[PDB]
């Protein structure tokens, strides 16, 4: 059934399994036209589908040509999400395939369904964490490949850079969500804290700037402030 | 107008004919129902003064046979019975007649609710759901599961009703994945219409018989068959105009003989929200929707 805190172990475990999340397939900027009405412009977009034990992600790339002369696109972009993690599915070796598919919004779960009968040993599950990859957009350099892309295209990621060389799965798992759940709480203070100090690189076949253990551990530590701090310039506390 | 006699009643038991009941008293001297109108299929049916539990019941065609009851004190029911002998059956009836042991079937002459009821119902197809092929009656009660349940145990007793699943490869054709899910007209026309059932009639009867087999015998996967049959009509955009216009008169009848104190357990909030308010056909139903919302304002 569904994903929550009481199986979170599970999540590393090693039954190949992929976290799916739609929130920035449909993306729009809104803006008032010349007549004083408001209009939609789309904007490129990904599917956000990445295994939580490997760190694969498997962006794909959503072009805004997609959605010319469509209607009711919100509820296409559930359904475009389905075909692209099926068809992905359906490129992967039978070994590589999952065993489960993890949605983060429960309006994925039938559209998901429907589009993988084929696989009906495929289980498709909800959760009850909030997982922050609506923050995705936030990492500069999967920011710059959605933006620049003039056609469909899908992109291979490691989300985890090379810290699984010095963690484990579930380590890199609670450093990515706390970047990204700072990075959705505050972008320019989380972006500010990873890049304060010039001499921290980003390699270019990295993410995330190559942090020694330590820094990692002084790095972690300004994202909890952050994420602690924002929570009370929001409630005042 | 035919007859459906009986040996006895050795124990007290309120008997259906079709939407009609009456209290019999153990070893009361009753021996049948008489005037039963030819031309429709009929349920007689049973519910123990001692065991609420288990109603069950016999549809039959009075056309097809000469049919009796006899209790049997093994099985402890009352079971429904074929007579070969039709002079043994002529000279057994009009013995009972003549001595006025039997209930007249009492028909209001104003009253065509059991032909709105089971207008489509025929009873060479109910055999087919109702698998037991010696009998010409067919015997139901209210724990006989369906083929569908038995696939989410005994075969032989199943209720072999089509089965429709919204999200399964029949219903959902490989690259048509969100337009046949949200109108379902491939599955209805294509699929079950004109693959299945051939036509519409027998899809209505059907539904109907699924409906029938839920009200008179609590039966719950005749239940969900009838809400699946309704909600794959509505969520189709493309239904051609004279099965709406059945289908409002169907339901109408079916929500006026509802027993108002079972709505609670019979009708499906949400199938019944969807179907009037949501769904493609929410403004095709007119009849069904201005009595739903009449009596049954709470579900909505
Ligand atoms: C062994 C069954 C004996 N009874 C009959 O044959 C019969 C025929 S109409 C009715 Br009422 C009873």
Not at chain 2, 45 to 65: E, K, L, P, T, V
Not at chain 2, 94 to 119: A, C, G
Not at chain 2, 209 to 232: P, R, T, V
């Given at each position: ?237 | ?50 065991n609420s539990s288990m109603r069950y019941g016999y549809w039959f065609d009075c056309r ?237």
């Amino acid at each position: 059934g569904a994903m929550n805190s009481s199986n979170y172990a599970e999540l590393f475990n090693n039954d190949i399994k992929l976290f799916v999340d739609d929130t920035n397939v449909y993306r729009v900027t809104v803006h008032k036209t010349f007549e004083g009405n408001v209009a939609t412009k789309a904007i490129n977009g990904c599917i956000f589908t990445l295994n939580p034990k490997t760190g694969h992600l498997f962006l794909k790339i959503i072009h805004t040509s997609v959605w010319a002369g469509q209607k009711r696109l919100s509820q296409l972009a559930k359904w475009k999400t389905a075909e692209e993690v099926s068809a992905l599915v359906r490129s992967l070796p039978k070994e590589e395939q999952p065993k489960q598919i993890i949605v983060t919004r429960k309006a994925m779960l039938d559209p998901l369904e429907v589009h993988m009968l084929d696989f009906p040993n495929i289980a498709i599950r909800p959760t009850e964490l909030r997982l922050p990859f609506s923050a995705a957009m936030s990492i500069d350099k999967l920011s710059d490949v959605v933006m620049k892309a003039t056609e469909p295209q899908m992109v291979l990621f490691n989300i985890y850079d090379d810290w699984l060389d010095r963690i484990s799965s579930y380590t890199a798992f609670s450093r990515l969500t706390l970047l990204l759940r700072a990075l959705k709480t505050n972008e320019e203070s989380a972006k500010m804290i990873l890049l304060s100090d010039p001499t921290i690189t980003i390699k270019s076949y990295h993410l995330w700037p190559s942090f020694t253990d330590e820094q990692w551990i002084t790095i972690e530590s300004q994202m909890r402030d952050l994420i602690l701090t924002e929570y009370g310039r929001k409630y005042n506390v | 107008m035919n007859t459906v006699p009986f040996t006895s009643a050795p124990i007290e038991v309120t008997i259906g004919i079709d939407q009609y009941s009456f209290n019999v008293k153990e070893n009361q001297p009753f021996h049948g129902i008489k005037d039963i109108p030819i031309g429709h299929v009929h349920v007689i049916h049973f519910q123990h003064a001692d065991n609420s539990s288990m109603r069950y019941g016999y549809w039959f065609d009075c056309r097809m046979g000469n049919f009796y009851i006899q209790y049997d004190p093994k099985d402890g029911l009352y079971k429904m019975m074929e007579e070969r002998d039709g002079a043994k059956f002529e000279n057994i009836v009009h013995n009972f007649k003549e001595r006025q042991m039997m209930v007249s079937y009492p028909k209001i002459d104003e009253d065509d609710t059991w032909y709105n009821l089971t207008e489509f119902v025929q009873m060479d197809k109910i055999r087919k759901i109702v698998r037991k092929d010696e009998n010409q009656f067919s015997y139901v009660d209210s724990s006989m599961t369906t083929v569908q349940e038995n696939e989410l145990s005994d075969p032989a007793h199943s209720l072999n009703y089509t089965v429709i699943n919204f999200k399964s490869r029949e219903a959902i054709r490989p690259g048509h994945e969100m337009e046949d899910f949200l109108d379902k007209s491939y599955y209805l026309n294509t699929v079950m219409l004109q693959g299945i059932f051939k036509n519409s009639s027998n899809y209505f009867g059907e539904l109907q018989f699924a409906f029938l087999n839920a009200m008179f015998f609590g039966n719950y996967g005749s239940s969900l068959q009838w809400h699946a049959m309704i909600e794959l009509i509505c969520s189709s955009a493309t239904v051609p105009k004279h099965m709406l216009d059945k289908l409002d008169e169907i339901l109408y009848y079916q929500i006026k003989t509802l027993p108002e104190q079972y709505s609670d357990i019979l009708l499906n909030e949400r199938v019944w929200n969807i179907c009037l308010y949501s769904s493609f056909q929410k403004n095709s139903l007119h009849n069904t929707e201005k009595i739903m919302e009449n009596k049954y304002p709470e579900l909505l």
